[PDB]
Amino acid sequence: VSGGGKKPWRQKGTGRARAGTIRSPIWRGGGTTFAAKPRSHEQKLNKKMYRAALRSILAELVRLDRLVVVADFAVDAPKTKGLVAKLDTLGLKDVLIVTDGVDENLYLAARNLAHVDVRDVQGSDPVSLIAYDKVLVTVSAVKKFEELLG
Amino acid sequence: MKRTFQPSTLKRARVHGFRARMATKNGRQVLSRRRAKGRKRLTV
Amino acid sequence: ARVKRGVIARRRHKKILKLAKGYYGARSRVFRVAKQAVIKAGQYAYRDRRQRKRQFRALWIARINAGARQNGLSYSRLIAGLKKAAIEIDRKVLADLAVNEKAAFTAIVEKAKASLA
RNA sequence: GUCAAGUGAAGAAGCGCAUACGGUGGAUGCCUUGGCAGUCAGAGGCGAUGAAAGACGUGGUAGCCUGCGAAAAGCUUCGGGGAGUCGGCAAACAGACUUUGAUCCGGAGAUCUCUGAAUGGGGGAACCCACCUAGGAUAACCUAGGUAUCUUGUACUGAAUCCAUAGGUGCAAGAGGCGAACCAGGGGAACUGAAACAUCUAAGUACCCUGAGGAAAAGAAAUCAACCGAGAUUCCCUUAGUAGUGGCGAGCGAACGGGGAUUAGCCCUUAAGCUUCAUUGAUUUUAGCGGAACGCUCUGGAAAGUGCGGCCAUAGUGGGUGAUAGCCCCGUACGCGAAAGGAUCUUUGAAGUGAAAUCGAGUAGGACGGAGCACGAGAAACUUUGUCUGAACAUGGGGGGACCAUCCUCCAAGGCUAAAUACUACUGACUGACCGAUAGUGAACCAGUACCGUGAGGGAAAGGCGAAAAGAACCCCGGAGAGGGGAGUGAAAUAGAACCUGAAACCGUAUGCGUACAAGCAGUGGGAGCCUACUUGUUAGGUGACUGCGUACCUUUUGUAUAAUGGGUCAGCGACUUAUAUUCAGUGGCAAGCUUAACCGUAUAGGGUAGGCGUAGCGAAAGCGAGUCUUAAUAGGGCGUUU
RNA sequence: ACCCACUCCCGUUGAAAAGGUAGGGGAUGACUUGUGGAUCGGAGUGAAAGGCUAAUCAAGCUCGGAGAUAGCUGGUUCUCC
RNA sequence: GGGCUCAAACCACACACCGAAGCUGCGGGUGUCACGUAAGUGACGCGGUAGAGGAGCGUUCUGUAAGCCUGUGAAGGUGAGUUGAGAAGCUUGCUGGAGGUAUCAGAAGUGCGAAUGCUGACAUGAGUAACGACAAUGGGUGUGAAAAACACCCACGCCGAAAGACCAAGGGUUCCUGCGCAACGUUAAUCGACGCAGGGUUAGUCGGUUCCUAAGGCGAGGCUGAAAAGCGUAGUCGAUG
RNA sequence: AUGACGAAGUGGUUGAUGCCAUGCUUCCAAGAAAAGCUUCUAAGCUUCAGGUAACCAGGAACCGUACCCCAAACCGACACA
RNA sequence: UAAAAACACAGCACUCUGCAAACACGAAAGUGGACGUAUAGGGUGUGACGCCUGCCCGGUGCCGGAAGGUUAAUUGAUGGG
RNA sequence: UUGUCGGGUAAGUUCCGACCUGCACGAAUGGCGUAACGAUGGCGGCGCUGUCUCCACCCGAGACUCAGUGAAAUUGAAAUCGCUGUGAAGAUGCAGUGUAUCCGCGGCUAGACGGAAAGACCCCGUGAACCUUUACUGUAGCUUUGCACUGGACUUUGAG
């Protein structure tokens, strides 16, 4: 904190409580006692711990009927209207789309959609696999999941 | 009772003015410090 | 991250002062004075749950003594007589009879007098 | 009826409690104008062509801020732009400008007082006094330019002193000063720790000083290694808190080796580079342009909210708009855009430099005294040098931690060299399990201000009407006041300008009950009466006569009502955190294995298994090994082995 | 006059962070005084009291090392078992 | 303490009774064991500082959440009722006028009465002390909303080697005039060194500048010094002359 | 305030700490400097320039100036004994 | 909060100092001493004046001496590895 | 020790003179005297007096009352009596008892261990500062010698 080098008054005699600085954390406008500094919050997760959690999530998604498997999923043009029509045929509104390789047109078509996310297999984090109402996954991405976690 | 401040603008200038400060290197440091803090008044 | 204490602190202080209602001076207006008064009143209230049972029994026994002496018996002789003749009417009910049902109380005293001799 | 005795309400100067309504005050909530921290870029300097920083001026009207400089909220021009404009506090009237394209935005020019390195001389900064040249006025001057010092170079002159030299004069080029950090170097504490203290630590830290650059420094083995080899420098992770060092105290603390990031080497028989000026193309930056798609209905002051039905999306969690908007506005994704200037890459060319010339001699080595190497004299190698000395010449020399021999490895006393690395005062964008007016910058507000100080220096407080001023015409009291009462505006005025909400302390007015024969932590247990309200008395609320019991709290103590400590009260703030190593427990993953670090990675994935721990111990150790150590001992015994 | 400060009283939240009233000493001198200047922090200056160096002196003030250190004092905030 | 004496004292004996949060009764909660693979039963426990162990409440932010609630009224504020063993929760009247957040997780600037704590506000003392030289006032008139204090007049009193008039330093508009009185003035104020506006300072001779130097400063070269610098020559400043 | 006129306006005495006086006397502690000013020349200049005197003509720039100043305006936080 | 008997003082004495003085401030240059030169300058003590100022050189200091002992850096005989 | 004697007083731990038994004077840290001087210490006297016996009266300024303005320290909260006991050992608050209607104003200071300043005395802390010295360890300065700058010559000086 700015200033605060000088002792505000002599230690004895004035009748006040003894003070060393006007920036004591006791004082208004003084320092924060345990002032924060920029620190990192990332924990370590074991590689196998991460994979075991992914296996648990994938098994639970199948058991809860929240996993939808399709042979393929491609859109022709990067049009949001086209993707909405495709997902309405499958009856999906809140959905995470997992593909082996994220298509450039598919990425653009889903960018503005409210509750639709398109991810590569490597990009399918535990949080997105749980948050989204359904996880539509292609057959190619299912096999790519098997190689990674099995 | 004579008090400690007996004003003399000539003495004030010769001891604390701009040219008194610029004459030495520690005086130039005062002007650098007071410019860095942004003092509206630099010398007296 | 930063947590202001104003709303929670005000709710705490108001609960204490609401309990200090009716107290004199600072004991009903000033928090750190009202806080001591609310604690002390609680200490008294806990202790006076015990003392109330003693106070009422002393009151029953005194009224039974007055009622029985009107019938020729002291309290101690009546209680001994009420044990010789197995009468288990307690002192709260006995003190109510001695005041409100004097004919009933006289019958009990005569039953104790007969039992003694 | 008289007397007597007994009993006895009501009558409160004031006070208490409750409730209602106010006042003061400015908490809380909500909000944001401002901050804080990162990430990605940019730029890494400005200055004698006058800087940073200022003073004084400059406007129709006073001041201050902003801009600008006697050409003075500005002039010229080139682009953008297309209807308003004459900056803000902070408006009111004036006078104007503008589709003959103004205001505004960007590039380039012009002007640019005075002070400040300040530089013609002087000086108490913003002032005083000059000289020289050229021109033009005749009076008492005017315009333009020049006039500092030092360094380098050059020309002319030039003493003591003959030649010279020192010196002097002119000219040309350059420098000086400022800036938060980063870099290299000179000088260099103490508190503190060692539970005292001197060696030691703190620490080559703080600070002072010098120099340079966008980076700097270093850098191409007289280097390690170990008989195998590696192959400049710099940086990150390990090795490892190990070897060692240390009043062997407190502490300090490697390297070898390994994994990575970057990669580059060139010359003294004169090069790679670097600088400048051309020059060929690429980008990039400094203004901008277009940019989709919504209606009805209900509540409402107002619709974006309700209900119903649509459409756009490479644009959907942006900011506003009278409450919550993809489709109302500004934007956003996306696609275009430069007359002119800046910058970065490049293709050639030109000089300049690197440049020390020509392979290193007062050098290597040595003695003394220091310093550094993790290494404090130690058995002390190596580097460096204040004093003093002092080689050899590849058939030579340096190192391999005393020293010697053998072996290996290198070639010092000459140079230049990018990248990976450090930092952010500054500019832009983006972001936040950051703050939200006692917080966050000291500073949200005309803050480094007010104020305090001789001075260096210290250093505040202070945000919110409403959607919109619609900011209350008019009437009345009042001093042609202050302040109010109406009226009106507004959805709301107890939103009325000290204006959102509007807490507490604290101060009042009103009502109810209690209170003037009564002794103390002021309550608590019992409890009459009165009052109020309905539920009309086994009720609720207020008060509470009388009475039992009863010496606050915190701290500190053997022990506190203590006449021990602390607190006038309220409101806000105010104290076990964080990082890195580690042990134990719990709970998970994997399991004779487990796990990665740096780093890479269209990046929380995946790779990377160098390293760490474990699977074997004993011994000081060589070593041996389910054994080992001690010992003459295969005996005893120690530790270990059956998980 | 001016410089000084011996006594008493007052004043002591003062008119005043050292004064006032009444008395007192020096008053051509080692005098008093204005303006300007020099000397300062382990330093100055001192007819010497550890005096004075901006109401601060047995080592000024200001900023920095710095959040020195404090085996000491104080304080340490919601609930229940 | 009142009072007490064939006691209300003392000695002995006896039968009664009072007396605690002890024991029992009745209702409830909780700990640990055991039986229970259950709800629950059984037994024994349940004062407590330092301290260890266990289980929770609440606050701010993040996710859940482009959800849900909300102008038919959010947060906050202020009452009432009600629920739990507690931290606390819930419902509602009024105020308020735009935000809030279920649940379960995750993070903390997470809880205040003390620190002669810090900042602001406001009390008590108390309408008390004081209103700053004991040189001194009285009256009349005017103006004004209002006059002890302003202006004028008539008196009185005080200073007069100053309490008068100046120059310097220092200050800086305080000077004068018109309007004005909120605050400032230790009271009031029409008055003012106060507020708003306007005006006012005229030099050959006064004082500066300019000329000259004192102490002293700076100081080309120079000498000295790790650097920063120190000293000083030529010079150049510097009045108090 | 307004604009014309306006009488007397003379002797004596006393008399400074002011002036002569930067003098005079005396003493010891022995009492600024520089320039302006007068004069003399050197280098230079030699009909010149420059100097002197007279007359005529003209000029004298810039800054301060209000006000308080033993004080209510300065130093003392104050309209401060 | 001390004005004194404290400090100073004239006078006295001791001692240092031959001038580039001793001594002091300064890393140094330099400066003061002093534009002085032992009748001078510094330091120390005493404190007008009058009468005086006695004894002790063991300790410590200072001054003078240098036969002997001891004694630094340095040098490196000799011995042992 | 107020030594003893003498003087001074009615009475003199002070004073003056003296004695010498100097706890523990003493000769330039000077001894002993000393005119003059001193806001210097002690003692005595004259005068003078409200210093006092012993205070009285008077005059101004406060205090007091009214009108205007308007602080302070302190403060856990107060419904804040005596006495005797008790008690962290000296009680407005505890026990017992006595007294006592409620509330101001002028006064006074016995208490509220009254207010003010984290006692300064005392002790402690392996606290600080500054001062001293023949405490320790250092060090500026001063001084000794070697080597360097640094040379020629001649002479007294050991071994080759």
Ligand SMILES: [Mg+2]
């Ligand atoms: Mg802060």
Ligand SMILES: [Mg+2]
């Ligand atoms: Mg990984």
Ligand SMILES: [Mg+2]
């Ligand atoms: Mg009344």
Ligand SMILES: [Mg+2]
């Ligand atoms: Mg100049």
Ligand SMILES: [Mg+2]
């Ligand atoms: Mg100059």
Ligand SMILES: [Mg+2]
């Ligand atoms: Mg010659």
Ligand SMILES: [Mg+2]
């Ligand atoms: Mg430079």
Ligand SMILES: [Mg+2]
């Ligand atoms: Mg220590």
Ligand SMILES: [Mg+2]
């Ligand atoms: Mg540069």
Ligand SMILES: [Mg+2]
């Ligand atoms: Mg380089």
Ligand SMILES: [Mg+2]
């Ligand atoms: Mg080889």
Ligand SMILES: [Mg+2]
């Ligand atoms: Mg659009």
Ligand SMILES: [Mg+2]
């Ligand atoms: Mg609204």
Ligand SMILES: [Mg+2]
């Ligand atoms: Mg070489």
Ligand SMILES: [Mg+2]
């Ligand atoms: Mg060497």
Ligand SMILES: [Mg+2]
């Ligand atoms: Mg070597």
